[PDB]
Amino acid sequence: NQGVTSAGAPLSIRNNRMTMGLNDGLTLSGNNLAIRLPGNTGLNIQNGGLQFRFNTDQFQIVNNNLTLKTTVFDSINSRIGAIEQSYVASAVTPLRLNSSTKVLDMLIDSSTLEINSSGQLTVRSTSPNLRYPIADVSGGIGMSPNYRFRQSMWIGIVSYSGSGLNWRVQVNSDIFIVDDYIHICLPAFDGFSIADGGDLSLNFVTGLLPPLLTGDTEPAFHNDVVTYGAQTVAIGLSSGGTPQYMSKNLWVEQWQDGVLRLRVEGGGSITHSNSKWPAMTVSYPRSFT
Amino acid sequence: VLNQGVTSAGAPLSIRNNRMTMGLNDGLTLSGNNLAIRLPGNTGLNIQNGGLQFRFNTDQFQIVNNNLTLKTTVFDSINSRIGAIEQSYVASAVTPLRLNSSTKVLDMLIDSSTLEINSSGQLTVRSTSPNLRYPIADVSGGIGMSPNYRFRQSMWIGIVSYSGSGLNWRVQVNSDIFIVDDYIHICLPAFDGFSIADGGDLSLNFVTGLLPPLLTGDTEPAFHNDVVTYGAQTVAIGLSSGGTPQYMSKNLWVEQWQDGVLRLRVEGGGSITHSNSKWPAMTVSYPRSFT
Amino acid sequence: SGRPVLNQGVTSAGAPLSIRNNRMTMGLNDGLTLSGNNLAIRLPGNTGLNIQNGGLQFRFNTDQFQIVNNNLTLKTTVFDSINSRIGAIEQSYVASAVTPLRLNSSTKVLDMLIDSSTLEINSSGQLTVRSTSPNLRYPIADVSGGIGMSPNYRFRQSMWIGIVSYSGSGLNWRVQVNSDIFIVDDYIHICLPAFDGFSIADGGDLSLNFVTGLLPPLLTGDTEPAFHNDVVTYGAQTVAIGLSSGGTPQYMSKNLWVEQWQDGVLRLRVEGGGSITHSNSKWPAMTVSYPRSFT
Numbered sequence: 001n002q003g004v005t006s007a008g009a010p011l012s013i014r015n016n017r018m019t020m021g022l023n024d025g026l027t028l029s030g031n032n033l034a035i036r037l038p039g040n041t042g043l044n045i046q047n048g049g050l051q052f053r054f055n056t057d058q059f060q061i062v063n064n065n066l067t068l069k070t071t072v073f074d075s076i077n078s079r080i081g082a083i084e085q086s087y088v089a090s091a092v093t094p095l096r097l098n099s100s101t102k103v104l105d106m107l108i109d110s111s112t113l114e115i116n117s118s119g120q121l122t123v124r125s126t127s128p129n130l131r132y133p134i135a136d137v138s139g140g141i142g143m144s145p146n147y148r149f150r151q152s153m154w155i156g157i158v159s160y161s162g163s164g165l166n167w168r169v170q171v172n173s174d175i176f177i178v179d180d181y182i183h184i185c186l187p188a189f190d191g192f193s194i195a196d197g198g199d200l201s202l203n204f205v206t207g208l209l210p211p212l213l214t215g216d217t218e219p220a221f222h223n224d225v226v227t228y229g230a231q232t233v234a235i236g237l238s239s240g241g242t243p244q245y246m247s248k249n250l251w252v253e254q255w256q257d258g259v260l261r262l263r264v265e266g267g268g269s270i271t272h273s274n275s276k277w278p279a280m281t282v283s284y285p286r287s288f289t
Numbered sequence: 290v291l292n293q294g295v296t297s298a299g300a301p302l303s304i305r306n307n308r309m310t311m312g313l314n315d316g317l318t319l320s321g322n323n324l325a326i327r328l329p330g331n332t333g334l335n336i337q338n339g340g341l342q343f344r345f346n347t348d349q350f351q352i353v354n355n356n357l358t359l360k361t362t363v364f365d366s367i368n369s370r371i372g373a374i375e376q377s378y379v380a381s382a383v384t385p386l387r388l389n390s391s392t393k394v395l396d397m398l399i400d401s402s403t404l405e406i407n408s409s410g411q412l413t414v415r416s417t418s419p420n421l422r423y424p425i426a427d428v429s430g431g432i433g434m435s436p437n438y439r440f441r442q443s444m445w446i447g448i449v450s451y452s453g454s455g456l457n458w459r460v461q462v463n464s465d466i467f468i469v470d471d472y473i474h475i476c477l478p479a480f481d482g483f484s485i486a487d488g489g490d491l492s493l494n495f496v497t498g499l500l501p502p503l504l505t506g507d508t509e510p511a512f513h514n515d516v517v518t519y520g521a522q523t524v525a526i527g528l529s530s531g532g533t534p535q536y537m538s539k540n541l542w543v544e545q546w547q548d549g550v551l552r553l554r555v556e557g558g559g560s561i562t563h564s565n566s567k568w569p570a571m572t573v574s575y576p577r578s579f580t
Numbered sequence: 581s582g583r584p585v586l587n588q589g590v591t592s593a594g595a596p597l598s599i600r601n602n603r604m605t606m607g608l609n610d611g612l613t614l615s616g617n618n619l620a621i622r623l624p625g626n627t628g629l630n631i632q633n634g635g636l637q638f639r640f641n642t643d644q645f646q647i648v649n650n651n652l653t654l655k656t657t658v659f660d661s662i663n664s665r666i667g668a669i670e671q672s673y674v675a676s677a678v679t680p681l682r683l684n685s686s687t688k689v690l691d692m693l694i695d696s697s698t699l700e701i702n703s704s705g706q707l708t709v710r711s712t713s714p715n716l717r718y719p720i721a722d723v724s725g726g727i728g729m730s731p732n733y734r735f736r737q738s739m740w741i742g743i744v745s746y747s748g749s750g751l752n753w754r755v756q757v758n759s760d761i762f763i764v765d766d767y768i769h770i771c772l773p774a775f776d777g778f779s780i781a782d783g784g785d786l787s788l789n790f791v792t793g794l795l796p797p798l799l800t801g802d803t804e805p806a807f808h809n810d811v812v813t814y815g816a817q818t819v820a821i822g823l824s825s826g827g828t829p830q831y832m833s834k835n836l837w838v839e840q841w842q843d844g845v846l847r848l849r850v851e852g853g854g855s856i857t858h859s860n861s862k863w864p865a866m867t868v869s870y871p872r873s874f875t
């Protein structure tokens with residue numbers, strides 16, 4: 001009576017002695033009841049009770065809720081802003097970016113453009129299209145030396161004919177071709193009687209020195225009839241005595257089938273049986289393709 | 290003799306009618322006969338390993354000095370994905386390249402006058418034509434020498450006039466004209482004229498009579514209006530009083546061109562009295578003015 | 581029971597229970613406390629722990645955290661604003677380039693490699709072809725922007741002032757002449773004026789000494805024929821020469837041609853045409869032409 005004879009859990013009595021039942025998590029510390037916190041799991045008895053512990057840089061409490069400090073992601077939100085601000089996502093032709101290989105390259109026309117051995121871009125050097133007499137003269141565009149000067153020779157027959165007089169003669173003659181003119185340089189020669197008027201004929205069908213050809217003696221006026229290069233020449237006329245020199249008019253009259261005709265006329269005449277012709281050069285513009 | 294023992298108690302203990310009971314707030318509860326800590330729900334707390342513990346995802350968190358902390362591996366992915374981009378990526382383009390740091394679009398600046406993007410999208414040079422100057426010209430597809438420069442033919446139908454020591458007279462003639470490279474050639478026919486002086490000038494009047502497309506200017510010499518002694522040659526002219534002509538060797542040359550009139554000098558070589566002259570054919574040549 | 585004192589009620593307790601002066605009390609460490617008259621858990625401050633929903637619970641931001649198998653775990657929606665921004669760059673981005681394109685992995689700059697002898701960057705920042713002057717060999721040349729024919733090849737005038745010499749069978753003598761020289765295309769023209777000389781023979785040589793007398797920009801070598809020093813019969817023509825001994829001249833026709841050029845002396849042949857005795861010659865003006873050598 002007035003004593004204590006029974007007790008409600010977690011108190012219990014045995015033989016006048018009271019003890020207390022504890023689950024895990026409650027324990028004895030010195031003489032006192034305490035919360036038991038095995039290990040280090042962020043819980044601790046500190047500042048007068050039970051508290052939770054968290055790295056101060058990574059976490060914080062807001063209205064007593066565990067929260068993440070925003071300064072956690074700063075290094076990430078920066079390293080990505082440092083890109084979104086400027087980077088290449090697409091490329092326009094001639095550029096092409098393979099979104100998968102992360103590889104960019106360029107579309108060049110191989111015909112016009114190429115890459116240096118030094119990895120540079122440069123224009124394909126193309127040989128220019130040239131028509132004779134324009135040609136590659138030692139590296140550059142120039143003038144074919146062959147157009148400017150070509151030397152040959154003619155060994156052939158010169159035929160005179162004028163109102164019923166006829167004779168031939170063999171001559172040896174230099175030929176020069178220079179730009180658009182040809183020059184036949186006839187030596188002096190002897191022949192027979194000439195008429196007041198007549199034709200002198202150079203037969204190029206035979207006798208030109210290779211690689212020259214009969215067609216190479218065709219005038220630019222082809223086979224028209226002309227009075228081209230009209231000049232005055234002097235011819236010794238005689239009957240075996242001292243020749244008398246007669247002035248005569250000579251010109252290029254017409255070219256036909258590789259035979260060039262020169263007219264020889266004017267000056268009045270004289271009975272004679274032999275003629276002493278001088279050297280005469282004959283020039284005319286030459287045919288081309 | 291007696292001992293009644295415990296007769297009173299302090300909180301959280303109390304005693305009523307011989308029975309002692311213990312008061313509990315929230316968070317403290319009876320498990321069986323044992324006092325226990327109450328953990329409602331699943332908030333991360335738990336009774337384990339002998340007592341109260343906190344439970345955390347062991348890949349995302351760890352305990353350092355008994356403080357909750359993020360594992361660095363939690364970020365490992367992020368740091369390598371970003372690093373794999375950092376080490377090599379395009380941030381800026383320099384001309385002719387251009388980066389639009391907004392639309393993330395890269396292209397290229399070109400000069401369309403010389404360069405173009407072809408049909409298939411490649412980069413071709415603009416196939417053009419070389420700047421040529423007459424007499425150089427496009428000869429059927431290539432850079433060549435213009436045919437009109439190499440040979441052009443025309444005609445002159447007009448008056449040659451003679452003048453010398455009071456003698457004056459005119460003759461109508463027609464002549465082929467050949468222009469070849471930088472020279473002109475006028476091909477005069479033999480003709481009949483009148484008395485001549487020892488010295489005198491024969492004049493060709495190109496002011497009219499040239500046949501299209503030739504014009505008077507086309508007969509100007511490269512030495513223009515200068516006085517010269519060009520192409521000096523020897524010509525034989527027949528002098529007569531109506532009888533058999535005597536042929537005098539005279540000296541002829543191109544003297545001067547003036548306002549579309551070409552003047553030739555005819556001089557030297559002796560003289561007789563006469564009233565009629567017989568001129569041979571003469572071809573007159575000189576270098577041509579060019580623009 | 582012969583036990584002096586018979587205990588009734590509770591006469592002893594164990595820790596954390598204690599009796600003092602017949603009262604019983606319970607010792608409490610930090611973390612356990614009284615609220616009203618009840619045993620209670622003390623949670624100083626705000627560390628995320630709280631008594632609520634009937635007992636002890638932990639509190640976390642419901643956006644950033646969640647519980648799984650009763651474990652604190654990171655929500656996914658907290659990393660999603662990052663895995664997207666990144667996934668959005670991983671798709672389309674340049675990691676490397678091929679020439680003429682070149683990327684500096686350090687400066688993160690993309691440039692273009694160009695050969696500057698063929699390509700330029702105009703004043704607009706455009707890639708354009710450098711207008712290159714092509715290889716031209718005289719007489720082909722730059723004629724006001726175009727590929728044309730050099731005016732100096734088409735025509736040049738100058739002058740020779742020097743000595744003409746006659747030689748033939750003991751006969752010999754010289755004269756000073758002033759002559760024009762015209763160079764047209766591949767020909768040279770020497771326009772000799774009329775001069776007076778002395779005794780000529782049936783055949784002989786007229787020599788023009790070009791070693792001096794040429795007016796700049798001309799040089800002795802510019803008078804070398806295309807056929808160099810060959811002996812030729814070039815441009816043979818007929819000239820009339822007045823011969824006399826004081827009184828009335830007789831005009832003799834002779835044959836002249838260019839025969840040979842050698843060491844700056846052009847030699848003309850003069851022969852043919854019959855002969856008379858005489859001490860004076862009147863030469864006409866005579867023009868002389870031949871193809872000119874070239875480089």
Ligand SMILES: CC(=O)N[C@H]1[C@H]([C@H](O)[C@H](O)CO)O[C@@](OC[C@H]2O[C@@H](O[C@H]3[C@H](O)[C@@H](O)[C@H](O)O[C@@H]3CO)[C@H](O)[C@@H](O)[C@H]2O)(C(=O)O)C[C@@H]1O
Nearest residue numbers: 027029030034035036037038039040041042043044045355
């Ligand atoms: C988070 C933490 O520190 N957890 C420890 C825990 C708690 O402090 C108590 O459980 C709360 O009542 O104690 C543990 O050790 C119990 C023994 O501690 C011994 O000394 C310890 C002391 O408890 C620690 O706080 C201190 O940091 O280190 C000391 C080392 O001497 C006492 O001497 C002994 O009587 C016991 O009470 C436990 O298991 O409960 C260990 C936890 O790490």
Ligand SMILES: CC(=O)N[C@H]1[C@H]([C@H](O)[C@H](O)CO)O[C@@](OC[C@H]2O[C@@H](O[C@H]3[C@H](O)[C@@H](O)[C@H](O)O[C@@H]3CO)[C@H](O)[C@@H](O)[C@H]2O)(C(=O)O)C[C@@H]1O
Nearest residue numbers: 318319320321325326327328329330331332334335336650
């Ligand atoms: C994290 C967790 O399990 N939380 C539960 C919670 C805790 O286990 C206790 O608070 C620890 O003391 O208990 C809850 O259930 C209350 C009843 O539990 C009964 O014992 C259970 C116990 O819940 C389990 O944890 C244990 O493993 O099994 C025991 C046997 O059933 C008690 O016997 C009863 O008196 C109550 O305490 C609670 O709501 O508090 C359930 C929580 O989810």
Ligand SMILES: CC(=O)N[C@H]1[C@H]([C@H](O)[C@H](O)CO)O[C@@](O)(C(=O)O)C[C@@H]1O
Nearest residue numbers: 064620621622623624625626629630631
């Ligand atoms: C997280 C939280 O709410 N903690 C509070 C607790 C609880 O109210 C009781 O301890 C539960 O019984 O304790 C205080 O009274 C205290 O010691 O100052 C206030 C403190 O802020």
